[PDB]
């Protein structure tokens, strides 16, 4: 292996939920990208990003609602144009090795548009809106919406901490949708 | 005048339903239409008639819903699904855009509570979100959601929901991490 040294692949195994033999398959990926962009030597420590437009278009976030933030969250300088590091980073925390709270500290951090740390009731409103994809009418929309933050707000300041936030039974499905006609 | 029904049926069922009696009226021609030789065209007499369940399931309406048989069971006169025309418009009422969100989950809790003594317990749990996400979650992922589920909203500590548990919850959230499993 000629990518790395040891003590570089050593700190991605430190920092990232990968194998070294992950991290490998994973530079691999983001190097084909865009091969005549990214090197194929990482000892010398390059300065180089891959720009949004590919990430994007990739088959692990083309069809997630959220890609755009996702990858501005994870990007170095916040205009989704990623780094090997950035790449790494976000596919660690993506991985089925993350922990629950985790993803879900993450998730927050796309969610809070306005990034004042809190999911306000337009954050969630944008928020709900989009991950239901229409399944939801916009008057079912505010419904959830009004339960949540009536259940979940605990410091009843209509808004989520990241503390509610986690707390919250973030991926029960939606019980009554069996019971429209 | 119409002649299905007398005059005091079609007020009892307006009264009883969240339909108009034009609604009922259209809703009546819907089951009859479902076996035209089996339900007669004179309700006047209160005909004991029953549509059996698999024509029920294999309605437009309800062959695409995974618990279209529970549904049916529990509207159902007897429990099996073989379905009255008050069964039909009562299930149909409930199922309509007019009915509460708080009326739905009381008649979700009867449909996931699977052997029918009023409590979803982890098994009845485990089989209804299994259900709802069939390609959407693991096996893995349906137990750690059914496992919070329960801490969260088990509120006797028993190891099950109540229908004030499963009211209080809440039941039509999307799923928010989603974005962060890769599929
Ligand atoms: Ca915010
Ligand atoms: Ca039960
Ligand atoms: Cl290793
Ligand atoms: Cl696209
Ligand atoms: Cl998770
Ligand atoms: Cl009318
Ligand atoms: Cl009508
Ligand atoms: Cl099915
Ligand atoms: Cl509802």
């Not at 990007?75 to 660690?92: A, P, Q, R």
């Not at 998730?107 to 989009?130: G, S």
């Amino acid at each position: 292996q000629t990518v790395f040294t040891h003590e570089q692949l050593e700190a991605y195994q430190d920092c990232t939920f990968f194998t070294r033999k992950e991290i490998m398959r994973l530079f691999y990926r983001y190097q084909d990208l865009a091969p005549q962009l990214v090197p194929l030597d990482y000892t010398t420590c390059p300065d180089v990003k891959v720009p949004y437009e590919l990430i994007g278009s990739m088959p692990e976030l083309k069809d997630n609602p959220f890609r755009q933030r996702i990858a501005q969250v994870f990007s170095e300088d916040g205009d989704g144009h990623m780094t090997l590091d950035n790449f790494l980073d976000m596919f660690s925390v993506m991985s089925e090795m993350a922990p629950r709270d985790l993803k879900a500290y993450y998730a927050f951090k796309i969610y809070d548009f306005n990034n004042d740390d809190y999911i306000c009731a337009w954050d969630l409103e944008q928020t709900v809106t989009k991950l239901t994809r229409g399944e939801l009418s916009a008057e079912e929309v505010s419904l959830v919406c009004e339960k949540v933050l009536d259940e979940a707000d605990g410091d009843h300041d209509g808004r989520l901490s990241l503390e509610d936030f986690q707390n919250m039974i973030l991926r029960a499905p939606d019980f009554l949708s069996t019971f429209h006609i």
